[PDB]
Amino acid sequence: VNSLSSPNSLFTGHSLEVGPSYRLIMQGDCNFVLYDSGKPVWASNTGGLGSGCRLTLHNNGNLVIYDQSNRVIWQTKTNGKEDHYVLVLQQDRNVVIYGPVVWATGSGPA
Amino acid sequence: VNSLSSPNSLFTGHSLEVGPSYRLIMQGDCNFVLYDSGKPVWASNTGGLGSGCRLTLHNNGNLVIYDQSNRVIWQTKTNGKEDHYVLVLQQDRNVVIYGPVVWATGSGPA
């Protein structure tokens, strides 16, 4: 999967991936990093600032990293209209937050 | 991959997938269908209306299916602000168009 929809989280050790070289991972050392064939090309630069951290995209568009103590250690500060948003690791290697909802099939949640 | 970012297209026979059971495919018979473990649960209902068809998400948020003759055979008619949008097959099985851009790492296009 290469997307994370609000208000869900990407937990410790989990990643968004776009084969065969792109991996955006919420690391166990709290750093949120994008690797291109093993080389880090973007990151929140929060390594060592915690453990058991998670990445959460909120229903207002704000992206945040919480540590084990459930505290904020990094955020995009993009507080907009209450709706639904999505974070996407794209095939062009860009990582983007899109929203609000424009249209939906309604085939889910199911 | 389970997303399509504007202004790109999903060409004939190609799909967005969220393992292990969700498959959203632009079929060779021009129908755009979402299958859950082989069972169709949503579709544009455009089968038989063309061949060599493609699904395109525009930079204004409109989602369209063009036939081989490059004509419109189905669309969401969601014409909004000029920016960038994304179509996503979610793990909760919903298919959603999100936009405009809220934030981006700028790690792409690369």
Ligand SMILES: OC[C@H]1O[C@H](O[C@@H]2[C@H](O)[C@@H](O)O[C@H](CO)[C@H]2O)[C@@H](O)[C@@H](O)[C@@H]1O
């Ligand atoms: O509409 C797109 C939206 O659908 C699902 O969210 C639900 C809808 O917003 C609506 O049915 O209200 C529900 C809460 O009562 C809400 O969960 C999800 O698939 C969501 O991700 C999607 O953006």
Ligand SMILES: OC[C@H]1O[C@H](O[C@@H]2[C@H](O)[C@@H](O)O[C@H](CO)[C@H]2O)[C@@H](O)[C@@H](O)[C@@H]1O
């Ligand atoms: O900003 C998010 C956006 O980035 C990339 O699109 C580019 C930007 O809009 C900006 O750099 O202008 C470019 C055209 O001059 C445009 O391509 C893509 O990654 C896009 O999908 C993403 O939404």
